[PDB]
């Protein structure tokens, strides 16, 4: 398969109008991060929610 453990997100973008998160994989260097579609991150919802909260407060501050 192709399933790995997510450590943190490092960015957000829209690709063809759809949300994607720059995904840092645990146990792999930052150079190995990949852009991933939101709908593939269902098991990462705490991390996404926490990241979206981060982005909100970093925006406001």
């Amino acid at each position: 398969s192709s399933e790995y453990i997510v450590e943190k997100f490092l960015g957000k973008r829209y690709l063809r109008g759809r949300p994607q998160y720059l995904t840092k994989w645990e146990g792999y260097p930052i150079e190995q991060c990949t852009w991933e579609p939101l709908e593939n991150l269902g098991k990462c919802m705490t991390l996404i929610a926490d990241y979206e909260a981060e982005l909100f407060q970093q925006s406001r501050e």
């Binding site: 399933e3 790995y4 990949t34 991933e36 990462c44 991390l47």
Partner: peptide, 8 residues
């Protein structure tokens, strides 16, 4: 743990 499919 939190996992996801990895794009190539």
């Amino acid at each position: 743990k939190q996992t996801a499919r990895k794009s190539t």
